[PDB]
Paper text:
We used de novo protein design to generate very closely related proteins that adopt two very different states—a short state and a long state, like a viral fusion protein—and then created a single molecule that can be found in both forms. Inspired by class I viral fusion proteins, such as influenza hemagglutinin, we chose homotrimeric helical bundles as the fundamental architecture. We decided on a design scheme with two divergent conformations containing a constant six-helix bundle “base” and a variable portion with three inner helices and three “flipping” helices. In the compact “short” state (∼66 Å height), the flipping helices fold back to interact with the inner helices; in the extended “long” state (∼100 Å height), they extend to form interactions with each other.
The interaction energy between the flipping helix and the inner helices in the short state was tuned by combining hydrogen bond layers (“A”) or hydrophobic layers (“X”) in different orders in each of three possible positions. Designs were given three-letter names corresponding to the layers in order, starting at the hinge proximal position. Structure prediction calculations (Rosetta symmetric fold-and-dock) suggested that some layer combinations (such as XAX) would be more favorable for the short state than others (such as AAA) and that the short and long backbones states would be among the lowest-energy states of these systems. SEC-MALS measurements indicated that, in solution, XAX, XAA, and AAA were trimeric as expected; CD wavelength and temperature measurements for XAX, XAA, and AAA showed that the designs were helical and highly temperature stable. The number and position of the hydrogen bond networks appears to determine the state which is populated—designs with one network folding into the short state, with two networks, into a more dynamic short state, and with three networks, into the long state. The hydrogen-bond network residues were closer to the computational model in XAX than in XXA, likely because they were buried in the former and solvent exposed in the latter. By NMR, the average solution structure adopted by XAX was locked in the compact state, as shown by the presence of multiple NOEs from a 3D CM-CMHM nuclear Overhauser enhancement spectroscopy (NOESY) spectrum.
Numbering used by the authors:
A (entry chain C), C (entry chain B): 1 to 95
B (entry chain A): 1 to 93
């Protein structure tokens, strides 16, 4: 559940409120548009959090993949490179 | 990065618009600032959806990698882990 | 991680500003909300840039992985698919 549907929904409601604001500006409509922006930003944060969670799972999957390759046995150099890349991916996500 | 430069540009434009709004908060300038915010957020939604598509492509690539490892290395404990991880990834996307 | 905590808090600050905006939708409160929206967006852009970079690193890691598989098992039909997938991923990251 990446939540892209509700992210899109929140953008469309914001667009509708913007059109009404453009046609008949007022304090009421400015507040309504800012409230819609906040709701759209809320869905953006949720989508970003869900993405970051998937990234962590992918990196864990690659960790297991690289362990399988080590077990099979292979070139020293390529294994060292893959491990270093994995190390940097872990660091990036832990930052 | 992919479209990051466009997002960076749109952000700098918002900062410029904000500075003009701060010294001239007219109704018209407020509406134009809000217009720019929406246009920027539309770009963000687009970039997020593009990221999600790449995540699906990565996960399909890892599915193939794990199949390749099964054919070469056989049935291992580590193979069991990879399949479980992959199943969760496919379910979560 | 990856700034998600800062994004969540930034959203909370926006909501609090919106509460006071609804209380008195003066120009000062409107500009305060818009200034906070821009600051929040700056963090969103930064989070998306960090995400895109991790994506490229993961593709780089998968490229090394497939390099290792070819060195271990030689040419295979699954290797053909994986290299076409990599190229498509590399193309997606440019566009």
């Amino acid at each position: 559940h990446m939540g892209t549907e509700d992210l899109k929904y929140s953008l469309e409601r914001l667009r509708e409120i913007l059109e009404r604001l453009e046609e008949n500006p007022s304090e009421k409509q400015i507040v309504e548009a800012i409230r819609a922006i906040v709701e759209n930003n809320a869905q953006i944060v949720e989508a970003i959090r869900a993405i970051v969670e998937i990234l962590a799972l992918i990196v864990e999957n690659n960790r297991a993949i690289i362990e399988a390759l080590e077990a099979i046995g292979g070139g020293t150099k390529i294994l060292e490179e893959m491990k270093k890349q994995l190390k940097d991916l872990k660091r990036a996500l832990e930052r």
